[PDB]
Every structure is written in structure tokens, then in C-alpha cells.
Amino acid sequence: DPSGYNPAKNNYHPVEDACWKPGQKVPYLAVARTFEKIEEVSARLRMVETLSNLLRSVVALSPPDLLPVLYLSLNHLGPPQQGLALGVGDGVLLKAVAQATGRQLESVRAEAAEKGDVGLVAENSPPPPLTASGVFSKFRDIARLTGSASTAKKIDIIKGLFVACRHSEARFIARSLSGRLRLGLAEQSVLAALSQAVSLTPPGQEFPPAMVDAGKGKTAEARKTWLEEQGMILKQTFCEVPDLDRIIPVLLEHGLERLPEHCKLSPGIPLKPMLAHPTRGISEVLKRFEEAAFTCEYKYDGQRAQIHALEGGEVKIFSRNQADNTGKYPDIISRIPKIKLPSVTSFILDTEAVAWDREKKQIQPFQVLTTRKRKEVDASEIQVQVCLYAFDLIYLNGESLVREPLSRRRQLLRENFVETEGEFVFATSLDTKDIEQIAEFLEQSVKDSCEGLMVKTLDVDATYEIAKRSHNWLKLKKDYLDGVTLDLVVIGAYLGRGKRAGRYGGFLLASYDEDSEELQAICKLGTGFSDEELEEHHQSLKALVLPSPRPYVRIDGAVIPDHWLDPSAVWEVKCADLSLSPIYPAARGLVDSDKGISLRFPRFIRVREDKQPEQATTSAQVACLYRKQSQ
DNA sequence: GCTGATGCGTGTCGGAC
DNA sequence: GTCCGACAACGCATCAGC
Ligand SMILES: Nc1ncnc2c1ncn2[C@@H]1O[C@H](COP(=O)(O)O)[C@@H](O)[C@H]1O
């Protein structure tokens, strides 16, 4: 019986402990029961084993449901490049919860805010049982609804789900819709569970499967080593082809050992990009890299563009998160013939697209880039031009370069591609181990409109193998260095969600405007404090809660705090940059008549226990800092 | 026809292991 | 170090209300 389904039990048997009949649809309650057992524990290894048990039963009994169960576990709707999104947030969701439970919407909103979780409100307040594929399909139905009256149609589907929910299902339906499943298990653990499941219980056997536990005859050491090896086969393939729609049919038909024979890196199919680990100083860079020669490059402030040229000439462009951006950049597309030597027949390039001012011939801020339209059919209508800064080459003329060292990938990039100023340029770079030269290069990068340096080894562990290490590169920014900040007043707090439930998750901060003697909201703040500090803030600020705002506190367009606070606490906050804000009033009129100023990537540093609000950073100082950054 | 509100999509940080 | 999920500013696109 699905109500008693226990994928965390000892001696889990994929056949005998499943809670549905062979070949029938996996019930959604089996998924919900699995989620309960996963969120109850903190050790990822234990979460992986529990999910693996569900997956082995899916493989053994009902293999067509493997793909929807995996998406439900990731809370994804499909492969990233297809771009389906629910179009559902707390607004649509709580209205649906309110109507399903028959309660007033304010009562539902208030309880969800206090509890920090929509799932508990949806649950604790005729139709056939939900199935995993049925729920997944309805989720995709919600995402495809568009046009006038689509909100009411989305709500109707959601109410239909809640009406059919049993036991714990409503909790997880609502958390999924809210984007906050909170399992503690995400992409890497799902892949580990999948490789473990298909290794222990191979797909494609006639029911009942003759092989239920392929690890039974191995010592514990041989079992661990084997599962690690199978797990790396799945992880390397997925990093090249992060698309379960392609992988799972192949896995089900040919098994995991033969997977790389059928799914490999190829132009037109986005791959996982290499990411960067933040490093807090040049000395820390030499420590992570030890003896290995490395290169430093400008870290451009734009958007990543993974540019694919297929054999035959089709070009596709993907984002860092593998969204299809091809329709966004008809200007890039028309430029491709200019950037390659005539011998290049296909490639995958790793680049940064940066807004570029063709009148002044210079880079423009990230903010300017974000004003491009999402779709543009005529390059003629484009107003924000872009320059591509190329820094890697992943595939060339039919061959993957993923196992080549950066020294060779970079040489192939420079040898086979053609620069045009203001259109396509190789990232500015420096090969050195001299601490003083690196420090000056870091300074120069900021003067040249970049946010810092990327650092990459050239020959030691210098490949593009994301499954081996996804953060193989280092990012170095001046704002990571100690002593290289603003003192702001806490004027409000926001109730925490999830891991912050039951305390404050965020705070509203303000600068002191000397001329009006008012406090002006400047940004929110929600990271940089330890768990212990955040509880201390909850305890000390609760004494300062007020029913109504003070008349000298101005927040204009900011989110109204859940709790207004008597202005008293002053905190030191660090940011990457200041920005001209559409909503915050701080220093409005000092630089821009209509816009005040906010903080890019603010983080809490420490309490200024001995600073009164009137001695906080002033709005005039905020303006001065913004002007200094703006040349 | 306009607009404000909602949703999606483009970093820093600490905890458990 | 890895994995995960708290939380930031601010843009476009969309849609309900007007
Ligand atoms: N020279 C460069 N090499 C690699 N990434 C770069 C470079 N310049 C800018 N970037 C961007 O920096 C991001 C890496 O930082 P992060 O996303 O913080 O891991 C990439 O996704 C790129 O969009």
C-alpha cells in the first residue's frame, strides 16, 4: 500500500517492496513518500540510497515512468534548452491554495509567511489516485498555458491536483509549484541515485527481473569502487549531454556501460560550462594551484554565450544555464562567417557577450546589456550592440577538445579564429607567476571595465571535464579582499522561508540622508551572517518591532517589511558595485533625478555595535561612491 | 490602450558531509 | 572541496485590472 511505502527500509527489495502493480503507473504517493524519507535526513549518501531504492523499483516494474519521476525529483519540467517554465509563483499558488481549502487568501498568505513553507498550509487544511506521470503532465500543462485568462486556467489545474491529493501529496505538489521543494537532494545526488539504481538493478530485463541486486556478490570495497566508476560514466555523459530526454531512453535500452557510445558532446546540444571558485587573494591562488603554470584573464561583465556551429552552417547560442538564446542574437549569427578561418567546419566556443558602444568604442555596463530584447528577428532593430570576448574552444571540426589542456584549446582558438575589434576578440590575458604583475593586472582589469580576473591552469588538471571538477577555474575580485563597505541602518525584517523558517530571512537596510534627516531604503540583505548570528539578530531585533513605520523612514518602491523595526542597529555591508535603482530612494536626486542607488551583491560583514543610525553611511557618501565607480 | 504586479532569468554566503 | 539551498539587484515579457 502506497501510504506505507518505505524506500528507506532495511533490505529494500525493488520488486517486493514496491507499492504498485508491475507495469502500472507509478503512483505519485510513492514519490511523495520517498521525498518524506529524503528530507528527514541530512547525509547525502543516505538520501541517494533512498532515492535509488525508488528508482530501482521504477526501472524494474514501470520503466516508462523513470523520466517523469526523475524530473519530479529535480523539480524541472524538461531539458533546459526547451525553456518551459510554470509561470506560477506565490501569488497564483496561494490563491489556488485558498480556493482549494476554502479559506480567505489573507489567512493563507499570513500562515505561509509565518511557517515559511506553502506545503504545510496546503496539506494540513471520488478522484482516482494521482500518478507520477499524471502530475508531471499537469505541471507541463500549467507551463504551456498562455494569453488572456491563463492565470484562472492555471489555478484550475492546481485546484484539481489538490483535490485529488492524499496523505503527504499536497505538501510536495505545493512546494514544487512554489519552486521550493527543499529536499536537500538536487542534480548531483539525483545522478548518483540513478547510476546506483541502474547498476544494482539493470534495465531491460523481463519481469520479474532475474538480477535484482548486481552488487550482492562483491565485497563492500569492490562494491563502492564499482558504483563510483559507474557513477562517473553517468556524470561525464550528462555534463556533455545534460538532457534526460536524450539520456534516459538510451540508458533504458542499452544500459549505463554503453551510454557514451550513444550520447556524446556535439554541436547543437548544449553542454555544462566550466564554472569558477572564488578566491580571496593572490596568495590563495598560488595555494590552490601550487606548482602548476596558470593564466590570468579579464573577467568580463556580460552574459556567457556558448556558441555552437554545426557541420553545414547552422549556429545555435546557449546561456550559462543552457537556455537557447539563438533568437536573441541575430547579430552574432550574421557575424559568424567573419570570426573563423575558411577551414573551420564546426565548433563550440565559450565566450562572454558584452554590451559595446560603437560610437565611443568601449565596453558598456552589464545593466546596458540587460536591456536587449529576448527575441529579435532583424539585427537592424538592435539598439545595444555586443562584442564577444572569446576564452575557450570546446569542440572543433568534428572533434571534442574536452580532454585537451587549456594550453592546447587556447592555442587552437587563437590559431583558427579571427579577431575584429568591437565584434570578436580574445579575452585579454597574462601568463605569469609574479605576484606583483598579477596584482597590477587585477587593477588594470577593473580600469578596463571588467570585474576582476579569472585564473586557469594551462597544463596540470587543465581540461574541460566538468564531471571531474565543475569549478576548475578561479575568480579573483577586489571586493573579495579584506580591507579593499557601507554602514547601514536596519529598518525592517522579512520572515524566513525554508532553512530560515521561524526567524528572519532578510532585512531592509537604509542610508542616512543628512539634508532631510530621513532614513532612505537602499537594499535588502540576506547573506553573510552565520546561523548563530542570524538567530542573534532575530532575538535582538524582535525587541525593536513596531506596528507602523516611523515617519522619517522612506522606502518608496521596496518590498514592505513583514516587521518594521525601530531604527537602531547599524551593520557593516560589503557589495561588488553600486547601481542606479528603479525602486530604492537612497540618494535619489544626487546623481539621477528619478532614481536612487542600490547595492550589487550586498552581504553582511559585522555589527557596528558602537555606531548610532545618525552616523551611518550618508546618502551623499552613497552618491560619491557611485560617482567614483562611474569614472 | 495603459499600467502595476507577477514571474523568469541573468550573483554571495554558510552548513553538513 | 562538494553539494545544497538560503538570500541579493534589476532587466524583459506577460497579464489582470483599469
Ligand atoms: N575570461 C573569462 N573566462 C571565463 N569566464 C568568464 C570570463 N570573463 C567573464 N566570464 C564569466 O564569468 C562566469 C564565471 O563566474 P561564476 O559564474 O561566478 O562561476 C562565466 O559564466 C562567464 O559568463
Residue numbers in the entry: 262 to 386, 395 to 753, 756 to 902
What does the publication say?
DNA ligase 1 (LIG1) seals broken strand breaks by joining two adjacent ends during DNA replication and repair transactions. LIG1, the main replicative ligase, serves a critical role in the maturation of Okazaki fragments by ligating >50 million nicks during DNA replication and finalizes DNA excision repair pathways by an ultimate ligation step. Furthermore, in line with our previously solved LIG1 structures, we demonstrated that LIG1, which consists of oligonucleotide-binding, DNA-binding, and adenylation domains, completely envelopes the nick. Here, we determined the crystal structures of LIG1/nick DNA complexes with 3′-8-oxodG and 3′-8-oxorG templating A or C during the pre- and post-catalytic steps of the ligation reaction.
However, we determined the LIG1/nick complex with 3′-8-oxorG:A at the post-catalytic step, indicating the subsequent formation of a phosphodiester bond between the 3′-OH and 5′-PO4 ends of the nick. The 2Fo–Fc map of the LIG1EE/AA/3′-8-oxorG:A structure captured at the post-catalytic step reveals a continuous density between the DNA ends of the nick. Interestingly, we captured only the structure of LIG1EE/AA/3′-8-oxorG:A at the post-catalytic step of the ligation reaction, during which a final phosphodiester bond between 3′-OH and 5′-PO4 ends at the nick is formed. However, it is important to note that we pre-treated the LIG1EE/AA protein with EDTA during its purification and then crystallized the mutant in complex with nick substrates in the absence of Mg2+. To further explore the ligation efficiency under crystallization conditions, we performed ligation assays in the absence of Mg2+ using LIG1EE/AA mutant that was purified with EDTA pre-treatment. Our results revealed the ligation products only for the nick substrate containing 3′-8-oxorG:A. In addition to our structural observations, these results could explain why the LIG1/3′-8oxorG:A structure is captured at the post-catalytic step when the ligation reaction progresses, with the final formation of a phosphodiester bond between DNA ends at the nick. LIG1EE/AA/3′-8-oxorG:A and LIG1EE/AA/3′-8-oxorG:C structures revealed that 8-oxorG moves 0.9 Å closer to the 5′-end of the nick, which reduces the distance between the DNA ends of 5′-PO4 and 3′-OH to 3.6 Å, and both LIG1 structures share a similar interaction network with the ligase active site residues D570 and R871. Although we observed efficient ligation of nick DNA substrates containing 3′-8-oxorG templating either A or C, the overlay of LIG1EE/AA structures of 3′-8-oxorG:A versus 3′-8-oxorG:C shows significant displacement (0.8 Å) at 3′-8-oxorG toward the 5′-end of the nick in LIG1EE/AA/3′-8-oxorG:C (pre-catalytic) with reference to LIG1EE/AA/3′-8-oxorG:A (post-catalytic) and highlights the differences in the interaction network between the 2′-OH of 3′-8-oxorG and the side chain R871.
